[PDB]
Design a protein around this ligand. Structure first.
Ligand SMILES: *[C@@H]1O[C@H](CO)[C@@H](O[C@@H]2O[C@H](CO)[C@@H](O)[C@H](O)[C@H]2NC(C)=O)[C@H](O)[C@H]1NC(C)=O
Ligand SMILES: *[C@@H]1O[C@H](CO)[C@@H](O[C@@H]2O[C@H](CO)[C@@H](O)[C@H](O)[C@H]2NC(C)=O)[C@H](O)[C@H]1NC(C)=O
Ligand code: 23G
Ligand code: 23G
Ligand code: NAG
Ligand code: NAG
Ligand code: NAG
Ligand code: NAG
Ligand code: NAG
Ligand code: NAG
Ligand code: NAG
Ligand code: NAG
Ligand code: NAG
Ligand code: NAG
Ligand code: NAG
Ligand code: NAG
Ligand code: NAG
Ligand code: NAG
Lengths: 774, 773
């Protein structure tokens, strides 16, 4: 189909609209820029390679470049691979970029550069130099950046990339950068706010530095500023997961009461981890447009009960007061100032880490008349006692979050404690259902109906990671008549009663994954036929339950479309010679997707496929140790579309796939032990659209197995990490791979000859077998 | 050193005392008996192979054989491998055994044989034919077995190996086998007790059959019988994990009151799963010596409160009454007859699956004066309430088992429910003293008074409860003698460094699989709690996902062993964060540290300097380790064992001896090593054990493996590499063939991968004479 094989080890994409030729060589194990990059390339990404220098030769012909991404070709030792350390910093020879008259964006992060590269073109709007060794900014080195709008200089001096001195910035270094909108000097060991800064700035990042004091002039001229982040200067270091040095004399970051007066356009102020003890109202006199305020990880426990500053914040949308607790103090109650009633526009309130014993309805009264309140997050508070019925006055909320508490009768997992949650790297949920109460990771042992009195509006309840060891019998959730989603994962469900959960008449999704406990002990009655009573259930997750026994022999539903049954013991239930459970799933009449991966199914007894429900479309048998498979039995699965046999020990494919299924579109066989294909494997398999044979032991593929009238209809064919022998017997396959339009990933990287000797480790895409045609 | 390489793919042991020559060819993927088997072989095992026939050639020279184990060369389809099914039953030609004049034992289990093999020599004492397809026994087929003592015929007709008819035994089939001692007809679809049986019988196994009725005279002559097992005839089928058919009209197995009158030597009576409703005392009239009685999986719930039969069993040692509950009944109390007090000799009482709500002290009062009682098993009873102080009257017991209950403020896992717990295959803190096992209960909160009067306990098992408490040293105050606490599979909240410090005699603490509170950010955890435990020897903290700690150091003057696998030292030792690099340094007496499975893809500098001084055994297995600075082992002056198995290492050090002068045992199995360094083991005089198996090694040269080190090795593992057998490999091939160093699997998985000719061939068989023309 193609007249010229694509030999370039980079993906190449078009956007004729925007006149773009996108060349992506990310992580291609390159040690030189590859020859034959298109002359018309506009976007060239060389991120995560080992190219040791840049020169006028590098981009010679490439005069139409608007963006070079040359990140992490020499990462700082502590940030980078320890098995392939960069021996010496990127060397940039003079005149490498001056040619590139259209260059708009240059990322040179993670290259251990010692200086801001000179001779940059005046077209440059974005320069990124994070994670280098540049720790002295001189005005002279910035004259080249006349038209720069975005400048990232952070991570040049911190614990993962130390420079062992204070950061230096010359007086007025940035002032003549008259179009500069975004300046980031984070994670840099900076000691003072650099002045004077250009009045064009909209975003200023100075977080995770060693700034002890703001001078009252520091932000005088910054009347277009919309985002200011001063977090992590005088950090709160308790339980820090990074080396954390507090300001001496236990000082806060010292901010004069009028420091923000010029900042009339400010929308986001981040004062996280500044050891603040008070928030002066005077801070907010001349900002009424502030929408986001982060005051997490300070010492503001007393202030929260006072908080007059809140009176000045009527347009505030998000407020974070998390982790403000006084060390070794466990308060009886939460004490919110009445001032919270003045946050008319508030949508998100987060107060984790206040640390208190009992939540009472009255303590939340100041929020009662906030009409736009959508999220109330009281996670990680060691709350022992909360009458959940108080949330009847919060029907308007989307999320009520009490996760990680001590109650008994998404932000990243590291959010409040991580050093820099916006760090760029260089290694290679039920809310949508409506109102959600998150009681995950609490100490709830026993539940009953009255616990949920007045909460019938709830659409999602998260009970994940509690201690519920109850024989649920369908009387425990009686008020929750509108619940569509129940997360009961990581409890100890005792499924004695086939009536469990039946009172949840609106339930569409039930997760009882990781409730293995009672399934582990012999002689205990379990009723897996409990699905019969759940009349509108669409999806059931029963993963990692260690299920090896069941009192009932069949599960029935007229609604269920998805069953996840991974991490059980169907191998035990279907022990060879025991026919009793071979119809376990047969009566799930509307089931379209069944995951029975990780069931130790080293073989499938006869009867399993005949026992499958009739509309089954997607079947996973992945990670079962399957050593054999009677392909002809797929004839029983008349609606089968996707079969996943990945990570098994299969050694063969069927003589004729066409004869095993009329319907099969997507066949996943990756990570098996297949050494060759059958002579007529895919002949007449016209319905096939996706075939994964990667990570097998295939040596040879011939046209009889892989007819072109089937291959050329595939959306993807995965062939990498096989054992291809590149002899004259391989001429057809090599020609066909070189010349096909069918998508085949990792050609540049992992579609390799293993022999014979001449060709060992050679990419098949580059292979020249002219000697076979002499 | 050896003159003649051993090419036989079987293990050969010599045992001069017993005149034995043992040849074990178990599981060697054989399709014929190997040539060259020693002429003097006495014990030949060919179990789990695919040898399709036996003939007079099979054992021609082997006239000294006393035992042939030829099990599972053609196993019934449902019992055998589905990836490598047997095509055709084993064929045994005439005269294959008749010349083996000294043959005492013949195992032919799992061969799909249709008939008892004939032409067996008169020396034979043991014949095993389990899991064949022999379901009719005729007296004429047994006349050859005149001297047989042990006969195994079970598993020839059951759900895993069906024959589709009742088993048949001709009348008096076994009568003339006048030395027969052990007869097993289990798992056979037998419908009646075969009679008349020889009076020499000592053990009779008739379990898992279809016997509905015992006749009064079925055991009339069996005056030497010691073990009788009638289990699984009229089974109790509730929650059975196999296809189970009960006798009609839930009838019990019907046993006349006088059925056991001749059995005056009987020691063991097994009546498990016989659907019994009553135990007639009359059964035991003439049986004075009974030591073991299994009455599990019946319907004896009412009988347990009456149990007049116990008055006839003063010599009984073990009694099992487990899983006798009445379906859909949850009793308030346990009701043990006063008759239990006559069980003078009793050591073990098991009453699981009685199913009752509340245990009270007085309910165990018939056991108070059983002076020999050692085990009381009340597991799997759904008990909700039990004042643990009641066990102050049971200080004499070794184990009190309350595992699997619902209490709140070593038998195999499928013991009571499995079909045949003695079937053969074709494929703990008790030692510390008095043990209370509270594992798999609903205990959510503990306090000192819970353990009032239990100060005698040496081991407490709290594994698999709900305990989510900030233990502070006040919860176990009565347990002054406790040596072992298993606290695994709870939700320990390690806020206080005083946790567990009241257990002043604690030697072993298991707090593994308490990951819950280590999974959420911002929670204070005090890993320095070890300082307060003054005689703690072993601490297990596996699978806790620990990625953070408020304290920077763990301290102990006593701890010898720390297991810390399945945590996140990778996060604690994040490169550039030095704060936790001495976490283990102050465990001054530590000799063993397991930090496997901690995602340590590299080791930061400072880890080895920070290890405690007497560290001897270190596991860094399963870490995805991609590089290792061998020279840093010089910090570990007492290191003897280093486990780097299942990682991604590609190189060995230039000279191991220069990295460590103490190292004895080096495990490098399952890495990516493709070559050894030129002088790898030079002068490594302390090395005793080296595992390089499951790497990618192509060649080994003599310089890497000097003979003055090799000859000190106790074991050298090289199997499953990528050995290239060219003339460059001459030294290695010769050396492997002639060394006395122990190399496992030396003919099985030490194989050439090339060149083409020798591909797949064992290096031990390789002739490389063309390299020397
Ligand atoms: C941030 O700057 C400070 C200096 O202000 C660096 O601290 C110095 O480090 C050197 C080398 O460790 C010491 O000899 C000096 O005494 C230190 N001075 C002070 C004032 O502490 C610090 O190393 C820098 N941080 C990073 C991560 O590079
Ligand atoms: C045990 O013996 C019984 C008969 O005594 C076998 O049951 C017969 O099985 C065949 C074929 O499956 C049926 O056609 C007959 O109807 C059965 N007879 C009765 C009375 O049930 C049974 O198959 C045997 N069991 C095994 C495991 O082989
Ligand atoms: N781990 C834990 N901490 C608690 C609890 N109750 C209050 N806290 C407090 O929450 C903080 C985070 O954990 C701890 O630091 P601190 O202030 O000494 O007191 C602790 C509890 O039940 N558990
Ligand atoms: N699973 C379970 N079974 C219990 C419980 N309490 C009593 N049982 C009884 O124990 C038996 C085994 O489980 C069950 O069968 P059944 O007699 O219907 O009543 C059940 C409990 O809390 N859980
Ligand atoms: C190409 O470069 C321009 C200018 O920096 C950028 O806006 C655009 O997103 C880039 N396109 C891609 C797909 O990388
Ligand atoms: C709440 O906080 C204010 C200011 O911190 C305090 O003075 C007041 O007494 C507190 N009210 C209650 C109910 O605790
Ligand atoms: C919880 O609050 C409701 C009122 O909303 C009340 O009916 C109930 O008694 C309270 N429950 C408890 C246990 O106090
Ligand atoms: C429930 O909360 C758990 C634990 O925080 C979380 O992992 C899970 O995704 C939540 N479930 C849903 C459905 O959002
Ligand atoms: C469930 O159990 C309760 C006791 O908790 C019992 O009263 C009731 O009969 C059962 N309810 C249903 C809905 O079956
Ligand atoms: C589930 O199976 C059991 C019989 O084992 C039966 O008693 C119960 O009624 C069944 N329940 C449903 C909902 O089918
Ligand atoms: C089955 O899998 C395909 C992709 O493999 C997916 O797009 C489809 O929606 C799935 N079908 C069902 C019913 O889950
Ligand atoms: C050898 O066979 C005899 C006779 O059956 C047996 O007693 C002995 O245990 C056997 N030894 C071994 C090691 O197989
Ligand atoms: C115990 O059970 C026996 C026999 O059923 C009965 O006669 C006796 O009264 C029961 N005793 C108690 C305390 O239940
Ligand atoms: C438990 O029994 C002991 C007597 O051994 C008694 O002191 C104690 O009060 C009882 N405990 C409870 C909670 O009843
Ligand atoms: C404690 O009981 C558990 C659950 O049965 C068991 O796995 C564990 O081995 C026991 N611990 C000890 C130390 O015996
Ligand atoms: C431990 O906490 C309990 C309250 O649960 C209390 O009795 C005791 O004072 C505390 N112990 C210590 C060491 O503070
Ligand atoms: C453990 O470390 C903490 C501080 O992190 C300290 O306050 C406490 O006293 C230490 N405890 C012991 C037993 O060393
Ligand atoms: C390693 O070898 C060198 C060169 O002989 C020697 O000088 C050095 O001391 C040795 N180190 C150890 C730890 O044996």
């Amino acid at each position: 189909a193609r007249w010229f094989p694509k030999t370039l080890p980079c993906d190449v994409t078009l956007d004729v609209s925007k006149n773009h030729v996108i060349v992506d060589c990310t992580d291609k194990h390159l040690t030189e820029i590859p020859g034959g990059i298109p002359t018309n390339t506009t976007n060239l990404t060389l991120t995560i390679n080992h190219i040791p220098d840049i020169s006028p030769a590098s981009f010679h012909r490439l005069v139409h470049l608007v963006e070079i991404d040359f990140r992490c070709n020499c990462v700082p030792i502590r940030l980078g691979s320890k098995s392939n350390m960069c021996p010496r910093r990127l060397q940039i020879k003079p005149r490498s970029f001056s040619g590139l008259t259209y260059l708009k964006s240059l990322y040179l992060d993670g290259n251990q550069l010692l200086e801001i590269p000179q001779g940059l073109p005046p077209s440059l709007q974005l320069l990124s130099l994070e994670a280098n060794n540049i720790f002295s900014i001189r005005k002279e080195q910035l004259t080249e950046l006349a038209n720069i709008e975005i400048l990232y200089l952070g991570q040049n001096c911190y614990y993962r990339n130390p420079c062992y001195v204070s950061y230096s910035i010359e007086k007025d270094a940035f002032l003549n950068l008259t179009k500069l909108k975004v300046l980031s000097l984070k994670d840099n060991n900076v000691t003072t706010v650099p002045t004077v800064l250009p009045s064009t700035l909209t975003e200023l990042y100075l977080y995770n530095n060693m700034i002890a004091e703001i001078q009252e002039d520091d932000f005088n001229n910054l009347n277009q500023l919309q985002i200011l982040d001063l977090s992590g200067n005088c950090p709160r270091c308790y339980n820090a997961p990074f080396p954390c040095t507090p300001c001496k004399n236990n000082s806060p970051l010292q901010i004069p009461v009028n420091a923000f007066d010029a900042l009339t356009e400010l929308k986001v102020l981040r004062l996280h981890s500044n050891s603040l003890q008070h928030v002066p109202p005077r801070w907010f006199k001349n900002i009424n447009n502030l929408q986001e305020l982060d005051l997490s990880q300070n010492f503001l426990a007393k202030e929260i009960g006072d908080a007059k500053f809140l009176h000045f914040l009527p347009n505030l949308i998000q407020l974070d007061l998390s982790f403000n607790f006084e060390l070794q103090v466990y308060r009886a109650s939460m004490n919110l100032s009445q001032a919270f009633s003045s946050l008319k526009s508030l949508k998100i309130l987060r107060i984790r880490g206040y640390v208190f014993k009992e939540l009472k309805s009255f303590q939340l009264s100041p929020l009662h008349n906030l009409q736009n309140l959508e999220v109330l997050d009281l996670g990680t508070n060691f709350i022992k006692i909360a009458n959940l019925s108080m949330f009847k006055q919060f029907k308007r909320l989307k999320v009520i979050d009490l996760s990680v508490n001590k109650i008994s009768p998404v932000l990243e997992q590291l959010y409040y404690f991580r050093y820099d949650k916006y760090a760029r790297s260089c290694r290679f949920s039920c809310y949508k259902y409506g109102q959600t109460l998150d009681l995950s990771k609490n100490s709830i042992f026993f539940i009953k109906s009255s616990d949920f009195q007045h909460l019938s509006f709830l659409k999602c309840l998260n009970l994940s990671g509690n201690l519920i060891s109850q024989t649920l019998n369908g009387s425990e959730f009686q008020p929750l008549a509108e619940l569509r989603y129940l997360d009961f994962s990581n409890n100890r469900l005792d499924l004695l009663h086939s009536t469990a959960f039946e009172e949840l008449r609106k339930l569409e999704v039930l997760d009882i994954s990781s409730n293995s406990h009672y399934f582990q002990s012999e002689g205990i009655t379990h009723m897996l036929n409990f699905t019969k009573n759940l009349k509108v259930l669409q999806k059931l997750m029963m993963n990692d339950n260690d299920i090896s026994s069941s009192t009932s022999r069949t599960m029935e539903s007229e609604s269920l479309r998805t069953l996840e049954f991974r991490g059980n013991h169907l191998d035990v239930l279907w022990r060879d010679g025991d026919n009793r459970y071979l119809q376990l799933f047969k009566n799930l009449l509307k089931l379209e997707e069944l995951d029975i991966s990780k069931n130790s199914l080293s073989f499938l007894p006869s009867g399993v496929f005949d026992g499958m429900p009739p509309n089954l479309k997607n079947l996973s048998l992945a990670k079962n140790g399957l050593k054999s498979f009677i392909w002809e039995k797929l004839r029983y699965l008349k609606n089968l579309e996707t079969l996943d046999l990945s990570h098994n020990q299969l050694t063969t494919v069927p003589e004729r796939l066409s004869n095993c299924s009329r319907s099969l579109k997507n066949l996943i066989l990756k990570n098996n032990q297949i050494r060759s294909l059958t002579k007529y494997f895919l002949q007449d398999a016209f319905q096939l659209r996706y075939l994964d044979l990667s990570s097998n032991k295939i040596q040879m593929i011939q046209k009889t197995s892989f007819p072109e009238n089937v291959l050329n209809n595939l959306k993807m064919l995965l062939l990498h990490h096989n054992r291809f022998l590149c002899t004259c017997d391989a001429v057809w396959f090599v020609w066909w791979v070189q010349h096909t339009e069918v998508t085949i990933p990792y050609l540049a990287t992992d579609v390799t000859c293993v022999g014979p000797g001449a060709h060992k480790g050679q990419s098949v895409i580059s292979l020249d077998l002219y000697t076979c045609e002499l």
